[PDB]
Structures are given as structure tokens and as C-alpha cells.
Design an enzyme around this catalytic site. Structure first.
Site, PDB file in Angstrom:
ATOM      1  N   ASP A   1      16.833   0.567 -56.882  1.00 46.41           N
ATOM      2  CA  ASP A   1      15.886   1.187 -57.394  1.00 46.41           C
ATOM      3  C   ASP A   1      14.853   0.344 -58.555  1.00 46.41           C
ATOM      4  O   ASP A   1      14.530  -0.756 -58.127  1.00 46.41           O
ATOM      5  CB  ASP A   1      16.571   2.303 -58.780  1.00 46.41           C
ATOM      6  CG  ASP A   1      15.715   3.523 -58.805  1.00 46.41           C
ATOM      7  OD1 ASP A   1      16.533   4.500 -58.989  1.00 46.41           O
ATOM      8  OD2 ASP A   1      14.786   3.693 -58.627  1.00 46.41           O
TER       9      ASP A   1
ATOM     10  N   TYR B   1       8.843   2.851 -66.729  1.00 49.24           N
ATOM     11  CA  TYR B   1       7.833   3.287 -65.909  1.00 49.24           C
ATOM     12  C   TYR B   1       6.548   2.834 -66.854  1.00 49.24           C
ATOM     13  O   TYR B   1       5.700   2.410 -66.257  1.00 49.24           O
ATOM     14  CB  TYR B   1       7.968   5.023 -65.945  1.00 49.24           C
ATOM     15  CG  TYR B   1       8.896   5.138 -64.848  1.00 49.24           C
ATOM     16  CD1 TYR B   1      10.248   6.049 -65.238  1.00 49.24           C
ATOM     17  CD2 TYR B   1       8.625   5.289 -63.331  1.00 49.24           C
ATOM     18  CE1 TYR B   1      11.255   6.176 -64.278  1.00 49.24           C
ATOM     19  CE2 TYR B   1       9.651   5.632 -62.490  1.00 49.24           C
ATOM     20  CZ  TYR B   1      10.793   6.239 -63.010  1.00 49.24           C
ATOM     21  OH  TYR B   1      11.765   6.509 -62.005  1.00 49.24           O
TER      22      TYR B   1
ATOM     23  N   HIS C   1      18.327   8.158 -51.845  1.00 49.66           N
ATOM     24  CA  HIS C   1      18.266   7.010 -52.853  1.00 49.66           C
ATOM     25  C   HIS C   1      19.454   6.368 -53.429  1.00 49.66           C
ATOM     26  O   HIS C   1      19.338   5.433 -53.749  1.00 49.66           O
ATOM     27  CB  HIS C   1      17.455   7.777 -54.190  1.00 49.66           C
ATOM     28  CG  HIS C   1      16.754   6.933 -54.929  1.00 49.66           C
ATOM     29  ND1 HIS C   1      16.145   5.755 -54.570  1.00 49.66           N
ATOM     30  CD2 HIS C   1      16.929   6.857 -56.186  1.00 49.66           C
ATOM     31  CE1 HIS C   1      15.837   4.924 -55.695  1.00 49.66           C
ATOM     32  NE2 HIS C   1      16.459   5.754 -56.644  1.00 49.66           N
TER      33      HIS C   1
HETATM   34  O1  LIG Z   1      14.585   8.493 -59.808  1.00 51.26           O
HETATM   35  C1  LIG Z   1      13.934   7.936 -59.116  1.00 51.26           C
HETATM   36  N1  LIG Z   1      13.188   6.629 -59.703  1.00 51.26           N
HETATM   37  C2  LIG Z   1      12.448   5.895 -58.689  1.00 51.26           C
HETATM   38  C3  LIG Z   1      11.833   5.004 -59.444  1.00 51.26           C
HETATM   39  C4  LIG Z   1      11.301   4.157 -58.304  1.00 51.26           C
HETATM   40  C5  LIG Z   1      10.375   2.604 -58.387  1.00 51.26           C
HETATM   41  C6  LIG Z   1      10.386   1.820 -59.435  1.00 51.26           C
HETATM   42  C7  LIG Z   1       9.525   0.733 -59.428  1.00 51.26           C
HETATM   43  C8  LIG Z   1       8.651   0.692 -58.491  1.00 51.26           C
HETATM   44  C9  LIG Z   1       8.345   1.434 -57.467  1.00 51.26           C
HETATM   45  C10 LIG Z   1       9.222   2.764 -57.390  1.00 51.26           C
HETATM   46  N2  LIG Z   1      13.930   8.243 -57.696  1.00 51.26           N
HETATM   47  C11 LIG Z   1      14.317   9.315 -57.160  1.00 51.26           C
HETATM   48  C12 LIG Z   1      14.179  10.778 -57.921  1.00 51.26           C
HETATM   49  C13 LIG Z   1      14.863  11.846 -57.270  1.00 51.26           C
HETATM   50  C14 LIG Z   1      14.313  12.195 -55.905  1.00 51.26           C
HETATM   51  C15 LIG Z   1      14.207  10.750 -54.932  1.00 51.26           C
HETATM   52  C16 LIG Z   1      13.748   9.472 -55.672  1.00 51.26           C
END
Ligand SMILES: O=C(NCCCc1ccccc1)NC1CCCCC1
Ligand SMILES: O=C(NCCCc1ccccc1)NC1CCCCC1
Lengths: 541, 487
Positions: free
Chosen positions: B276, B408, B466
Site C-alpha cells: 500500500d 495522502y 487489496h
Molecule cells: O485504502 C486504500 N488506500 C490506497 C492508497 C493507495 C496509494 C497510495 C500512494 C500512491 C498510489 C496509491 N485502498 C483501498 C480502499 C478500499 C477499496 C480498494 C482500495
């Protein structure tokens, strides 16, 4: 004030340049044909992309090979067709180490109260021996407040942005700081800026004297780095319901648990903790049951040796370690030999400082042997609950200044008399001139540490004489075959070298060490020697 | 009811006067030839150990009572490791060579009971000699004989208690039966972590919105794989510092605070394995501090360097599946939502790839909430347990969500920073593992990775969402180990 040193050349030797020479000449080329790419004043092309950290190391290999080839046979000097600065570079970098009297010099002014720092034209080494650089950087990390790598801030030397930046960070005047470099060429703008210019040519030595000149003078052979203390990692394992063992960690594998004695702490190994890590080991300076940050249950059965040695395995288990080198001292030394005796599997090795391996006689009440020896009177004093506690706890300041003293110092402890006079600190003043072996701060640590557990728990170590005896009598028919090392201290009143002569009866191959002019507090008293020995031993076996 | 096993050849295979006591413990090993190899060449009996952890989990008293011996041998460590490992799954360890009373001397059975504190009918003994099971049944015990490599065995096992699977999940470390590290990298800031195993070092870095407990399934295995594991609680999470400020979570700051963490611990190099958000950090670690990185692995997160001529923000605004990322962008807001009822918040987030009750990654802004579409009492994922969930609640009950969310909120500067390494390549060993059904963070987002990371080895898990680790652990492990072993 502040001091800042370049790494390659002053803090780290031999300068990478050195080999640049014995490769130029080695390869028969025009003075600086190669040291050109490195340091020249006009950094351009690849290496300029390097120190600025635009490209990593491996990238820069080819780019530079070819760029050399330009000025190569295609512009004077004949550079071989199949030639590459890659292996000559990484090898000279790997073959380079720390300048002790320099790092030593650094730790001084930091202790003195200076702003210690490094400003080097660095690069990002993604090489195979990329580790070497990491270790040198791991361990140098402590001594310096700031680290300004050309390859991090994006401004190689002697471009002024870096110097002009070295100050904004240090928030100070240029005269307020002193600059140690080995090129002099990087030193020009430093002087011109109103900073102190000291060319680190030689190997410190002379630059060490034209250095002593300002600030102060430095030792001749100083004291090994003592891990100190908020700067360390703090482990916490819970081996049994109410019981948890606290400890301190430094270094990476393999594992060696440093076990302390009465009445001390893990801070006792302060001088050995770092060095040993650096020696290439994962150190676990533990706070024994009843001490400092680990559990101190009041009950006595709770400190039986059988219980501690087993709780010792539980500790390794939870941590997921199958084997450790156990190094004990004082009381722990006992435990440690017991560890070797009852759990050889989990013991890669054993070392004891001062404490010999003294198995009990089946036909001799354990108690009587204490009653007989005149120098174990205090042990009898302790035997009674509330009493010794009350004495030692009363004024902890004295209590420690009293206990921790060198082999050549007055203000001693009444190991012999104790019971008659009703104390050990009965004939001791109420202001023991602080030992030349500890610092008020070092003492104060122990106070706070013990302010949390009192002394019952630690004292209960003594109070298990009988059963300890009964238990250890189980291994009288055994031998200690895993690697062992016994180090004796010449002037340790109780726990005298003599008490070990018959050790090999049980522990053959038992290797040995001996420190002269040394008292009970081996570690604190003769650390450098303790280290030398412990390492050599670990390295050799 | 409780259960006992005999190492000799039940929890470890291949099975294995003066010996009448080496066992009782009067004499050690070397105190005695080609048998050491035999001991070495032997190992754990996973279905048995499995079967055991089952019963332990079923609320039984698990134990081993064996005719041991003390090993001062050279292949001594083999025994340690097996013992080190078995240790966590059994309550009492009755080893002959320790309490002095080999099997089948009836004193041991008498003692196992006094120790255990129970009726002989309340326990079931598992020996592979049967001649050691006579007294046991004799006493009025439940005797199962280990004839097969544990089949009809654990069959008669399932009989007495209940059914243990065949292809089970890998053992999940926990919960507070683990070591807890604490490093203070900077004045107010300290990083908490968990340790297991001995060298070399590998720091497991988690993602949003999780914890070190997320690696629960990989922590042990990896230790056992022969590594010192450091499952860390990332900045802003659980037991490490959670400063409120945003600049405090800049990637540049975290990656550097990462080196500070290794420094204080005295480690010069570690294998960094991210997932992640950490996955990002981890690739950055490789990119800015290759020296301290023996290796890098990312689960789900590809290496996505920024474009110099493309505001970072716009790329988020463009992608439809990063709507939530925009939602989060505003302070107090997402916090308020996620924090409101933490129970739902997690049941919602942690769900398999094949499950409803999802998260509104797409329409978060529009519906104004990443949970607005989510049920009110999400049927608990088949991927987590109420207990596992509860852990995360307590964990987050300490930090709230600001700190974690601020990951974020550093879009711009993160961009500005990482733009410094656009002219660099990732040359230290890397491994990218992609998850087939991970909605955001889809395999596709990595096809151009080797442009920057040649030699980039790869792994891919199918039917996986995920939460890679929690969802397909055994496969995650297989892969991670093979990789570590191979490079
Ligand atoms: O909670 C997250 N968080 C993702 C952070 C992803 C990210 C972080 C940094 C760069 C690019 C992408 N993702 C889940 C949420 C529930 C549905 C599937 C994805
Ligand atoms: O404080 C101690 N404590 C020693 C405990 C020794 C011991 C430990 C285990 C078995 C037998 C003896 N020793 C010093 C005190 C200062 C003067 C010299 C002895």
C-alpha cells in the site's frame, strides 16, 4: 562553535583518491587523468551528475567509462580499449575504513559541547559492496549532529551553495565553524568565507595538533563508545503473566545477550554494547529479573536460578531466537554457566566475567560453605529480608558511590564484617567521594533505575542458596562442552581468580582471559581490555 | 480436556543404561555417532503441529512430554529452531531430560497430570511407540497411536475433538506473545515495532489504514525462513508517534526517519518490504538510500515516478478511481467519517476480492463519504475475525485517523521531492508482486516499471484484492521466501 569533517580523506581512509592514483599510475596515465572525473573544481558530466545525485553509482559507471574514452586515446593518453573504472572504484571504497583518532577527535568536541558534522561530496551507492558504505555511515551516524551529502542536497564542492548552506543549517557564522578537508581546493572557499581552514593531509596526526590548538587537546588512547541511552532501542518481552523482561538492542545478527550482576543494570554494559554491535553482532543488553525496567516480583522463589535460566529460554523463544551467545558477569555469570549446563542447545556460547563455575558438593550443605568463607559475610547479611534493603535503599546516592569504585580506591564495602556492625555501608562515609570509575550522571542513572524496583527483587538472588544448590546438583554428572571463556580479574576481592583453577575439571577447552589491576566492576573498570578480549574470542570461536 | 504429543517422532520427523540416563538428563550428548545428522535431517510435522494449534485455538491445553536429552553437539541449533518454533504452540513442556524420568516410567505420566492439573481421562496422549502408551491408557488416558505420518492418526484426533483442515492457513503470530521494540528517532517521534527471528534484518512496512498486525501471517514464517523480522507500526499508526502536522508525513521525511530508525538500532542494511502506501515509501527507500537497502519488495504498489510537466494533483483528479484520495485531501472530514464508528470502518475496508459491502473509491466525492454506500453493520469479512478487527479498533483508538490520513495530504511536495530521482534507476534487488483484483492499484499500473527497475523480478497472485497479506498469506509467503532465498 562547530566542527565539520569531509568523509573521504579525513574521517574515512585511505581517501578513495589514493587508489585513483595507484590506478592512474598503475595504468600509466597523465597526472589526474582519472582524479579529474572525481575532484577537479569544475565538476562536469557524469561525476557531476553523481555527487549531485541525479544518477546513481552503477549508472555513472558506463557514462563515465565512455566519457573517459573520449579524453582517452581519443585525446592524448592511451586508455585501454577494454577499460572500466567500476571495479577499481567500488574496491577502493570498500577497502576504505574509519579514521579513529579523528572520529575519536570528533566525539571529543561533541562531548566538549560542539556541533559535530560531515559535509561530503557523496553519491548513491547501489553497488554490490554497497553495504560497506552503510556500516561506515551507520556507526558514524551517532557522533555527528549533521550530515550534508552533496548527493542529497544537490550541490557538490567547492560550489558555494553547499558551504553557504552548511551554515544556514548550522545557523551560525563561518568563523564559528572549522572545516576539515583533504583537498585544500575545497578549503579555499571555506577560508574565503571566514571559516577555519585545516587541510587534513597526512592521516590526521599533524592535523590533529594544529587542531588541538583550538578548543582543547585530545586523549592518547580514549574510552570505547558507550551506548548512551535514549539513543537506544528498548525491547520488552513478556515471558509469563506478570513477568516481563526489558532490554536494549544494537547491531545486526548473530545474537549475544549481555547479562548483568548485583547491584547493576544493562547500562553496566554501556561500553561493550556498541563495540560488540560494531564487532558484527546483534547485542541484547538485558535488565535481569528484579532490575530496572523488567518485572521485580517480591517473592523469593521467583528468583531461583532454575527459574531465571528457564525464564531465559522463554525470553529467546518469544523473540524467536533459537540460539544466543550468553555473556554473564557477577550473579548472571552464575546463571549463564547454568544456561550452558542446562540448555546447551540455546547456547551458542558462554562467557563469564569474574564468576567461576562453582558446582556444589552433594555432601556439603550450601549454606555452610558460605558461613565458612570469611569474605562472604555480606552474603549472609543479605540473607535476611527487609534488612539489607533498608540499608542500601536509605540513601541510594552513597549506596552506589560505595559499591562502584576501582580496585585502587578507598571507601570500600564491608564484605567481611557486615553482620557484626550491621551493614556494609556502616564503615563507609555519608558522602563517598565519587569513584573515578563513574560520573555523577552515570550514578544518577542507577538511582532512577533502582528507584523503580527498590532492592528486594535484586537481593532475592542471594536468598535461594538451598534450592539453587538442590537444583544444580542435577548436573554434577555433566560437562560443559559448548564453547566457554572465563575471564578473571586480578584484584576482585570476592570472586578471586583463584576460585577457578579447577574449572576445566568440568569445562575442558575452556578458553581464558585475565585482566590485571582490575576489581569487581570489570566492564566499567577496564572496558577497552574487556572488549578486545570478548571480540577476539567471538571472532576466533 | 487437553492433548499431548511426543517430539521423538510425532511433532517431528523423520523419526529418530548409558542412554537410560542421557535421556533422564544425567549426561549430555558429546558426553558419549552418525546420529546427529539424523537429528538434523529431521523436522516439523505440520499437520500435527497444525492439528495442535487447532486444538490450542479450540481451547485445549496443548503440550509435549518427550524423552529428551541435552545437546552440546555441533548441529545443536537445529534442535533449538524446532524447539524455538514449537514453543509457541504448547502450554507445558515436560521433557524427560529435564525432570529426570524417562518414558515409560509411570512417574512422568503421574507428573504430567500434577503439572497439567487434571484427570487422566481429560487428556489424550500421542506417542509413536505405543509401548509408551500402555501406562497412559492404563492410567485411564486416551491413547492414540502414531502409525501413519499422522493421517488415521489425526483422523482419530478429529474423532475425539473436531475437524482440522488439510491445506490450512499459515500460523499467525500474536498477539502480545511477541517482542515489542521502541526506537526514538527524533525528539517527539518514536517508532514502535515487533521483532521475531534472528538475522538478517527485514522490515515489514504496512499500508492504509492498517498496522504491523497486518503482517501477522508473514511475521513468523519469515522468521522461521531464517530472518530477523521487524514488523513496524508506521508513523501515525498504533504504538508509534502520531504527530498531527501534515509536513510531518511527507515521504521525504518518512524515508529519512526510516534510516534514522535503522541507525539507532545499529543496523546498516535491511530488506524493505512495503505494501500500500509503505510500498511507495519502500521504493523511495530504494531510490534515495540504496546503501541501507539490501532489497525491496512491494505488494500491490507499483513504482510510479511523477511527470515533471504534470501537476501531481491533476493526475489524481483525472483518475476516476482515486476520487476517495481527493475526499481524504481535506482535514477533519474523512477523519470524522472513519472515526465515527470504527467497527464498521474496518469491516468495510477489510473484505476479500469476492465480497460486497465495499468502499466508494469512485463516487466518494459526489456521495460525500467513502462509506455512505456501505451497509450500517457490515457482515464481518470472511477475511478477518471479530478479534482481529477489535485489535485494529484499539490500535486506532489511540491515534485516530489524522496522522494516518496525512499520508495522502502531501501530494505536491512528495511530487517535488521524488522528481529529484527521475534521472535514476533502481539497481538494488527488487520484486514486484501484483494482485489480480485490486481495484485501485491494479496490476496494469506497473507494465512500464522495468523502464526504471530492470531485473525487477515479479510475482502475481490471482483472485486477490487489496489486502494481499491478509487475503492470500500462504501464497504471499511462498513467494516472499523463494525470493529472499533465491536473492
Ligand atoms: O485504502 C486504500 N488506500 C490506497 C492508497 C493507495 C496509494 C497510495 C500512494 C500512491 C498510489 C496509491 N485502498 C483501498 C480502499 C478500499 C477499496 C480498494 C482500495
Ligand atoms: O557486590 C558484590 N556482589 C558479589 C556477588 C558475588 C557472587 C555471585 C554468585 C555466587 C557467589 C558470589 N561484590 C563486590 C562488592 C564490592 C567489593 C568486592 C565484591
Amino acid at each position: 562553535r562547530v566542527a565539520a569533517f569531509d568523509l573521504d580523506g579525513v574521517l574515512a581512509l585511505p581517501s578513495i583518491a589514493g587508489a585513483f592514483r595507484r590506478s592512474e599510475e598503475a595504468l600509466a596515465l597523465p597526472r589526474d587523468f582519472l582524479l579529474g572525473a572525481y575532484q577537479t573544481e569544475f565538476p562536469e558530466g557524469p561525476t557531476e551528475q553523481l555527487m549531485k545525485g541525479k544518477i546513481t553509482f552503477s549508472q555513472w559507471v558506463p557514462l563515465m567509462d565512455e566519457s573517459y574514452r573520449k579524453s582517452s586515446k581519443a585525446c592524448g593518453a592511451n586508455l585501454p580499449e577494454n577499460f572500466s573504472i567500476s571495479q577499481i572504484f567500488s574496491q577502493a571504497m570498500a577497502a576504505r575504513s574509519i579514521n579513529r583518532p579523528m572520529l575519536q577527535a570528533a566525539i571529543a568536541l561533541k562531548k566538549k559541547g560542539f556541533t559535530t558534522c560531515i559535509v561530503t561530496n557523496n553519491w548513491l551507492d547501489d553497488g554490490d559492496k554497497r553495504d560497506s558504505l552503510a556500516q561506515m555511515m551507520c556507526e558514524l551516524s551517532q557522533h555527528f549532529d549533521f550530515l550534508i551529502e552533496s548527493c542529497q542536497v544537490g550541490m557538490i564542492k567547492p560550489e558555494p551553495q553547499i558551504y553557504n548552506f552548511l551554515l544556514d543549517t548550522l545557523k551560525a557564522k563561518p568563523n564559528e565553524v572549522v572545516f576539515l578537508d583533504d583537498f585544500g581546493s575545497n578549503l579555499k572557499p571555506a577560508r574565503d568565507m571566514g571559516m577555519v581552514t585545516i587541510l587534513v593531509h597526512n592521516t590526521a596526526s599533524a592535523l590533529r595538533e594544529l587542531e588541538k590548538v583550538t578548543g582543547t587537546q585530545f586523549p592518547e588512547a580514549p574510552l570505547p563508545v558507550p551506548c548512551n541511552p535514549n539513543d537506544v532501542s528498548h525491547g520488552y518481552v513478556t515471558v509469563k503473566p506478570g513477568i516481563r523482561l526489558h532490554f536494549v538492542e544494537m547491531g545486526s545478527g548473530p545474537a549475544l545477550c549481555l547479562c548483568h550482576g548485583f547491584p547493576e543494570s544493562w547500562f553496566s554494559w554501556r561500553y561493550q554494547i556498541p563495540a560488540l554491535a560494531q564487532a558484527g553482532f546483534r547485542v541484547l543488553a538485558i535488565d535481569m529479573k528484579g532490575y530496572g525496567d523488567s518485572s521485580s516480583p517480591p517473592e523469593i522463589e521467583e528468583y531461583a536460578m532454575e527459574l531465571l535460566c528457564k525464564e531465559m529460554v522463554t525470553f529467546l523463544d518469544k523473540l524467536g531466537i533459537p540460539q544466543a551467545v550468553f555473556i554473564g558477569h557477577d550473579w548472571a555469570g552464575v546463571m549463564v554457566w547454568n544456561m550452558a549446563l542446562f540448555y546447551p542447545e540455546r547456547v551458542r556460547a558462554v562467557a563469564s566475567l569474574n564468576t567461576p563455575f562453582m558446582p556444589p558438593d552433594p555432601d556439603v550443605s550450601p549454606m555452610k560453605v558460605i558461613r565458612s568463607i570469611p569474605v562472604f559475610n555480606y552474603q549472609l547479611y543479605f540473607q535476611e529480608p527487609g534488612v539489607a534493603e533498608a540499608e542500601l535503599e536509605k540513601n541510594m546516592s552513597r549506596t552506589f558511590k560505595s559499591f562502584f569504585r576501582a580496585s585502587d580506591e578507598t571507601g570500600f564495602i564491608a564484605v567481611h564484617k557486615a553482620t557484626e556492625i550491621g551493614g556494609i555501608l556502616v564503615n563507609t562515609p555519608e558522602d563517598p567521594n565519587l569513584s573515578k570509575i563513574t560520573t555523577e550522571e552515570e550514578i544518577e542513572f542507577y538511582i532512577q533505575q533502582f528507584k523503580k524496583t527498590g532492592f528486594r527483587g535484586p537481593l532475592n538472588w542471594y536468598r535461594n542458596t538451598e534450592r539453587n544448590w538442590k537444583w544444580s546438583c542435577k548436573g554434577l554428572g555433566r560437562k560443559i562442552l559448548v564453547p566457554a571463556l572465563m575471564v578473571t580479574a586480578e584484584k576482585d576481592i570476592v570472586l578471586r581468580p583463584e576460585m577457578s583453577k579447577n574449572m576445566e575439571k568440568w569445562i575442558p577447552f575452556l578458553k581464558r582471559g585475565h585482566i590485571e589491576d582490575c576489581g569487581h566492576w570489570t566492564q566499567i573498570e577496564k572496558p577497552t581490555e574487556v572488549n578486545q578480549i570478548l571480540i577476539k574470542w567471538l571472532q576466533t570461536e
